Design a protein around this motif. Structure first.
Motif, short mmCIF file in Angstrom:
data_model
loop_
_atom_site.label_atom_id
_atom_site.label_comp_id
_atom_site.label_asym_id
_atom_site.label_seq_id
_atom_site.Cartn_x
_atom_site.Cartn_y
_atom_site.Cartn_z
N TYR A 8 56.22 31.32 54.77
CA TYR A 8 55.17 31.95 53.95
C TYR A 8 55.06 32.04 52.67
O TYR A 8 54.46 31.80 51.81
N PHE A 14 54.20 23.38 47.88
CA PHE A 14 53.09 21.81 48.15
C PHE A 14 53.06 21.80 50.19
O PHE A 14 51.64 21.29 49.91
N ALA A 15 53.56 21.89 51.21
CA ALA A 15 53.25 21.37 52.79
C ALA A 15 53.76 22.66 53.53
O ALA A 15 54.68 22.63 53.14
N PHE A 16 52.93 22.74 54.49
CA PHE A 16 53.19 23.34 56.00
C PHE A 16 52.79 22.49 56.56
O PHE A 16 52.80 23.51 57.96
N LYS A 17 52.81 21.32 56.35
CA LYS A 17 52.51 20.58 57.52
C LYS A 17 53.22 20.30 59.18
O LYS A 17 54.35 20.54 59.24
N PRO A 23 50.23 25.05 63.59
CA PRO A 23 51.05 25.37 62.48
C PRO A 23 51.62 26.71 62.40
O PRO A 23 52.42 27.00 62.26
N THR A 24 50.13 28.06 63.42
CA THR A 24 50.89 28.82 63.24
C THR A 24 51.32 29.63 64.90
O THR A 24 51.26 29.26 65.89
#
Lengths: 49, 49
Positions: A8, A14-17, A23-24
Motif C-alpha cells: 500500500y 491505480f488499482a489493488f484488485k 483483498p486484505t
C-alpha cells in the motif's frame, strides 16, 4: 516472509484488485508458493485481462 | 462476523484498503450490497429458490 504492508506504500495509485482471495488480511495468511507476473498493458485493457 | 439469528440492514461503504474514501468508493472501497445475475440462461444453482 511475504510482507504486503509495503504494497500500500509504494504503488497504491491505480488499482489493488484481488481476485479469488480476500483483498486484505492475507498478511497473516500462510501458504505454499507465490508467483509474480510483470507486464506493461494499456490502462483501458486492465479490465479485459 | 454476524451473530446467530441476527438481521443487519445498515449497508455503508466498506473500506477494502488503506485508502480512506468516506463516500468516494473506487479502489479499495467496494459497497458490500451486490445483486444477483438473474439470467434465465443460467442453469441449476443459479436460478432462484
Amino acid at each position: 516472509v511475504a510482507d504486503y504492508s509495503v504494497l500500500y506504500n509504494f504503488a497504491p495509485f491505480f488499482a489493488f484488485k484481488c481476485y479469488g482471495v480476500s483483498p486484505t488480511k492475507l498478511n497473516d495468511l500462510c501458504f505454499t508458493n507465490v508467483y509474480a507476473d510483470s507486464f506493461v498493458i494499456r490502462g483501458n485493457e486492465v479490465s479485459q485481462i | 462476523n454476524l451473530k446467530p439469528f441476527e438481521r443487519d440492514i445498515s449497508t455503508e461503504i466498506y473500506q477494502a484498503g488503506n485508502k480512506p474514501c468516506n463516500g468516494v468508493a473506487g479502489v479499495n472501497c467496494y459497497f458490500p450490497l451486490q445483486s444477483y445475475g438473474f439470467r434465465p440462461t443460467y442453469g441449476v444453482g443459479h436460478q432462484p429458490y
